[PDB]
Subunit: 281 residues, 3 copies
């Protein structure tokens, strides 16, 4: 199924008929970072399998729902169960849910992920406000926009220089300062490793040379689809480890360690994103 | 349809039957840089849709013709409407028209494109004679030659060290000197960004570190197919902007700005390529 | 055909029924480096075309057999005819034979390849014990593990920090010292160029900047599948040329030159790998 105007329209029509919510904010949350979704008020849960044209997710399994409702007095739509390109989903499957958000009225998209630290200032449990990216898939002919352009959504050749909104980064930092956790908050450049293997020790060393601050396996595809259709983005990485220190000390990384860092920071991140939503212009 | 010997032969047979021209030079022109094609003498226009085994181009639309005739006393074939990999065309679709040129008798291929400047010496409106490349798709398993080798055209493992003919570069520069525009002409290394998003500010900074002079979304696939089958190549980039300066000043780039630079340099480039064709050994 | 537990099991069942050998060591040999396979004792040759679910290899042609038997008193299985990703084989086709090795009982995989030298210490005819890698396909969304995870074989997110076993590297070097050829043996980082074009001169210069010691078109996919399912790996490159020196002197490389270096070192490499097999813990 192509992520075109007609197919996105049919999905949006279904959602409007069952939910009654017209959202202007969308959220996509990293693994272990989804508690805010469970606290959406007056919520409507819409399984992906019930939505016309949504991608089939039964091979990977686990949860896959759109959740609409209110947070901090604002109307939101959340993806509960994220689609990642290392799972084998196509460009069209990743793009369709973001283009549905656009047709529903979304103007701002808030994203979190788990990532490895490259910059030597970064420690496990730190946050990074993403200010730019290095898209290895895109340089290598696997950009999320390879294919015919869908002209109703945006231009053939997008400019990404303002993909990460500067005022949203400033608001996130201001809230951290108000609650005395600004010592955990950095800014940086995100390298997209297609995955699903963690970056090797020698890949980490290369990324240091190339000016990358953090590395992960998500986020950039959704940012590009959002920027193409005019949705503003804030993206925040939670640092699971420093891959450069681990390489120098011969220390390993695993998904269990990543999820334990997520559990340690989950409540703080939930409160931070609730306040960002409340305060958005 | 595979870009094999039998399929290329059937296309070549059709073209010979309708055009009567046996070309020894081929041309592929960048967007806004195609006026020379309209001035081919005693011309025969052959739509792609009429040629056996040529790729289907109706989803993208717009023009798609082969044009044969004479320029400066030499017999040429031009592609009018270029196939780009960011549109979703396969390796086989890109390769077939170049292999048809080979079977028609083409010995030299002349190429122009629009590109972004990385080297700090480069300004909008400058030209770059390409002397080498960094092929991010090829390093990343998206080389145009991935697939079975077509042995009638060339070897399993080509060497690209002489892909950009040195004497053709020297002739192009000599003509610029004769007409007092050599101050616009540089040489450099071309980075292939698969596209269709412009290189991000942080990607531009990375390319500076890695020794790239210019960046664009075309040219390298055709160069590789030509080199594989023994066709000599001259490739020239027209610089639309300096991406490093734009990153330092927070200035944007768009396709409209690119096309306006093309219009400013179109007549000079047309005259330059007509004289190169006339003077080729 | 997916490289899943049921499909690998059916292939393993066939092999057990015809061969009677339960191997604990697997070998994959580079082009021109396969003489050791012909000297396996009490050998059973099983063509790929006869094994349920093995990939079809008739388009490329040439040899394709599994060979089981004894070397130096140990039970081994060899791939005779290697599957390379530049030929167009999918992730699933590359992975299935390694996962069959796992189900047959393989605990150690020994690999050789031909490569180009980047580090200035490396000369034609030298050997490099691989200690890490830079996987350009994997960074660019063409990792061999892209797709659903096969949970019976390994985790969704593997760590590659110990993919190249340190004690196997030490044993290989010790044997070289015992036979007075340690002056030919180096260690280094392997860059995976998807291929099939040799790295361009400007690509070689980039790899020097990024800390790569050698470059080739194989090995990394098999290493990743082996590491995912818990098989230890030793990987050795034979250096065909120094690509940096060749770029500085404008000297070409071709497959004929590569095969002549292979012939010069074939007997030494055969004897070295026979002794490694004999001495493995
Ligand atoms: N303290 C503020 C509200 O702050 C919400 C918040 C708590 C913890 C982290 C970020 C925001 C008043 O009350
Ligand atoms: N001036 C030369 C012919 O030069 C053709 C040319 C004009 C402008 C740019 C490049 C070549 C004589 O007459
Ligand atoms: N020389 C040892 C056995 O060495 C086998 C070997 C020969 C050449 C290269 C590597 C190992 C005793 O006899």
């Amino acid at each position: 199924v192509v992520a075109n105007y007609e197919n996105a329209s049919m999905a949006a029509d279904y959602i409007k008929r069952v939910s009654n919510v017209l959202p202007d904010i969308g959220i996509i949350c990293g693994s272990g970072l989804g508690k805010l979704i469970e606290e959406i008020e007056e919520r409507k849960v819409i399984p992906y399998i019930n939505i016309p044209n949504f991608p089939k997710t039964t091979v990977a399994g686990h949860v896959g729902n759109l959740v609409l409702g209110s947070v901090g007095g604002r109307k939101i739509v959340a993806m509960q169960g994220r689609l990642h390109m290392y799972e084998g989903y196509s460009n069209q499957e990743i793009a369709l849910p973001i283009r549905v958000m656009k047709l529903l009225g979304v103007r701002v998209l808030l994203i979190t992920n788990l990532a490895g630290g490259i910059n030597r200032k970064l420690k496990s449990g730190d946050f990074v406000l993403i200010k730019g990216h290095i898209n290895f898939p895109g340089l290598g002919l696997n950009n999320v926009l390879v294919g015919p352009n869908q002209d109703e959504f945006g231009p053939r050749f997008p400019d990404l220089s303002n993909a990460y909104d500067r005022l949203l980064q400033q608001l996130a930092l201001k809230i951290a300062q108000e609650n005395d956790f600004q010592d955990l908050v950095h800014e940086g450049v995100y390298a997209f490793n297609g995955g699903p293997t963690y970056e090797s020790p020698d890949e980490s060393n290369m990324l240091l040379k190339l000016g990358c601050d953090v590395v992960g396996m998500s986020t950039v595809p959704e940012v590009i689809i959002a920027c193409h259709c005019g949705i503003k983005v804030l993206a925040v990485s939670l640092i699971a480890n420093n891959s450069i220190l681990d390489a120098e000390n011969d220390v390993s990384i695993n998904h269990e360690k990543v999820l334990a860092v997520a559990e340690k920071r989950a409540d703080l991140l939930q409160m931070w994103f609730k306040e960002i939503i409340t305060r958005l212009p």
